[PDB]
Amino acid sequence: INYYKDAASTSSAGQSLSMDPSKFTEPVKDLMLKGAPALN
Amino acid sequence: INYYKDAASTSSAGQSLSMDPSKFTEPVKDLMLKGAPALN
Amino acid sequence: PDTYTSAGFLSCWYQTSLILPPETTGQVYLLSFISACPDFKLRLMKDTQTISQTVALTE
Amino acid sequence: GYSDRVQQITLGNSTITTQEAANAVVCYAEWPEYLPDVDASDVNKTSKPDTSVCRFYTLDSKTWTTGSKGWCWKLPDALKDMGVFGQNMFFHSLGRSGYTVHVQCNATKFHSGCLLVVVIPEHQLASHEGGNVSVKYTFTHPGERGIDLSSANEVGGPVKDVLYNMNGTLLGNLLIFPHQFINLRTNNTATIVIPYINSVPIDSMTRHNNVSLMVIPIAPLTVPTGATPSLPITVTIAPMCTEFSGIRSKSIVPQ
Amino acid sequence: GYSDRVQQITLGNSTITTQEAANAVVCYAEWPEYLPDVDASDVNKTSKPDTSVCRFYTLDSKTWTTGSKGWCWKLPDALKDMGVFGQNMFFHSLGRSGYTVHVQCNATKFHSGCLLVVVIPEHQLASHEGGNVSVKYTFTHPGERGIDLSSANEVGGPVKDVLYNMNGTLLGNLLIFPHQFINLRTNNTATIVIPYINSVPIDSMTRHNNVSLMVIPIAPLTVPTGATPSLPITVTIAPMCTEFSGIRSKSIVPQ
Amino acid sequence: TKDEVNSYLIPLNANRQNEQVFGTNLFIGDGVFKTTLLGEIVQYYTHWSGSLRFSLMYT
Amino acid sequence: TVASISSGPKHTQKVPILTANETGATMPVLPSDSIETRTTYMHFNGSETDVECFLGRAACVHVTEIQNKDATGIDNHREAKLFNDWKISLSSLVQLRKKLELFTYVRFDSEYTILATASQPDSANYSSNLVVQAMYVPPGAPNPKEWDDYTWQSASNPSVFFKVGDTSRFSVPYVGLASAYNCFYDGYSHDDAETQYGITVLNHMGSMAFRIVNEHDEHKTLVKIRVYHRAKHVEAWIPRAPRALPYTSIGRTNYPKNTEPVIKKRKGDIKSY
Amino acid sequence: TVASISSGPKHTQKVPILTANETGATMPVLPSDSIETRTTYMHFNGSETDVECFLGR
């Protein structure tokens, strides 16, 4: 129950439960498959 | 009504109403019947 | 660092040996990295020993 | 014609027969079983030597005399040197096991005496010094010899006072732990099956013992007239469902 | 992008990667497998330590120099002291095993040299004395050290003459045995998978070795100018599908 | 003795056989690990569990 | 539910009262196996003997004390009680300890209540109003050195601010590393020849730090902190023999030497009533 | 959720542990690519490492 009118006044947000490290761990242009050779 | 998000914050648990003394009072391998001889 | 809770050691040795081509000399180096597997769990947040201060900063 | 009385336990390449048993206890009514995946944490596949480790090792014999106070063995320590069980133990980082314990003591229908055979999960001993003196490692790792409660206090060792279970509790209440009596007039062996009991799924076999087996004379031994005044007590123990994990170099432990 | 050239073998808790392989040989086109019942004789259930014995042990390294004649290891001897494999070995009456052998030797594109890596089932050695002099036990059980074909004749030892394979046959014909070459210009490792080969279903691991692994320089090592004139050769071997049976007291063997 | 680009480099010697390249314990919250991003984040939490990935790139 | 059924005379070959205790069992014998009984009902459920109930009331687990005074020229705040600190534990005081050690492993959430009262033992014009700040300093995180260190910023560490005279209350989930807390541990932290034995090595929970936020007034004020702990969501395994001798140390089983006989001696014979 | 799957011996031409870090990627290698593993579950969600939680006290 929100007792207040504005959105800033609500409690903390709830877990992204998004999670996708590939923008950080695999930003390569041509896709690399694990097990296939790195450099062909 | 829980007012809080986490489970630790809820009140005391409610009675097991489990109760089974046999693990402590009769841990024998071959079942003993009351009234039958203890050692055959 | 907890004892009971300790995780082991990591070592590295020559299996055969490094061999340089002719006209080449000296030491070669390895770079080493560390990252966590997707396996990983971290819990119970606290304050880091890695940063402290003695007076408030100002502009 | 089956009696509670006669029994055969075959485990590995070794068999025990008793013709004068008094049933058998299975701690907490649970039988040893391997470690389920749902309970697993370490990702390593474990090693299950099976029949080469799950057989019966008979420890060296003790001698019950009228002055005996009782003996105490720790597990897996007592077996730290038995065959391949022991090797596996020093060579893996983690291991887990249940046991069948068979304590033997026969006499005649003229003797009297009664031993308590009890298994205590997590038996943390007390220092006889009091205060917060610790009990050094060696002292709680007697090996197959076990601890002799009628031996003298030593320094860095535990207290050996029987009315207090080596920890500040009374002998009389040890009966809350899985146990069985050997009453010369009834019984000649005691058998207890121990499931693996711990707060972690697998642990180190050398830094932590998870049960102490204790044999304590309670009704003093009384032999017939002009009989030799003593009887030997033998303890035979078999690891069961053993699993080892995290193999490597081979632990080096104090002393 | 798979090449015959790069490979990974993971066995137990140990992994090997080679980026310059030349395929791998599987002796007689058969892969190690356990002992089927139809072939069994001993009635004992066997013990299969699995991952604690089926991992890769790297023996101590050798040094190929221009004067090297070749080295010879026997199996299971070479592993008689590796971890739990070895313990199991001394503790059971009978055992059986296949192996993955990985021989390693890297150099540069200016070196030349070529080693023959061969596995000989039942390699009965000859006495250098001639006649019917025997080859004493110790001499055919060098352990991880193996036999160094450029060492001197010793008394009670085998002959170490390379053009004769240590038995009266010519080096040139060793190619009828499963083998692979390491030619610095091509190759940097050799890998052979050995199935268990015997005339009995299971045997003693101490009185009989069932293969000798032999590494022999054939085209002499030639290093680039002002290079150090030698290369190390390393042998890593992993028991696979090992089974032990007839556990007991623990063999005591000469020397 | 003072932070330098050189403490990232593990040296290798040509022609040594059998010998040891480096050694370290695995207290990820201390010692070598401590300034790495992994080490640095682990320090915001009290407990960790999981697999680590250690890689070496040859130069 | 019947507490006793009706039962009459017996002349059988079936004797439920003869057993063999050597077996380790306690055979479930009832009044009606050996006397003639009448029906009676239980009228009772055994509600208040549930382990949740037994361990579920607040017990005092710790009393500490800190003072508000001029820190000018104090070389060791910790030592002046300018801010004490406590090594969270649940066995320093014994009423609750004997209760928990009836079990080997125990698992529960904790609810803490902290009461703080002030004392002014020497001449003050008044009673000041102080705010206490208790911080959770788990192991690995900077521990406070002065009563007003950067540590107290507590940007990542839970802290509660309440007033002296009031009470603070919050609840912490089960923070154990294993599946349960060990009430006992017959092990070491490693196979060292001289390492400590016991659980001391296992309940590495860390400590909790208290301080007054207020600067100093002209008089000095003693604030005494009492921490209460209530187990909620309790789970207990493997019952053990109750503690008979007195305790000597946090975390060891050790009892004092030349202790006194714990079993009351009869004033009379075995035959005495 | 599985934290580790069961995996056994390997003798392949497909080597997941050899990579080229020069590319800038961190290849997602797991215990089961280089040792033999057993199944285990995560039992955990990563709740307390959410940025809302990290900056939210």
Ligand SMILES: Cc1cc(CCCCCCCOc2ccc(C3=N[C@@H](C)CO3)cc2)on1
């Ligand atoms: C502000 C503020 C302060 C705190 C404290 C957090 C609580 C941490 C304590 C965790 C529980 O500690 C223990 C210690 C020991 C035992 C225990 N020892 C054995 C006898 C049995 O149980 C159980 C819990 O949190 N926020």
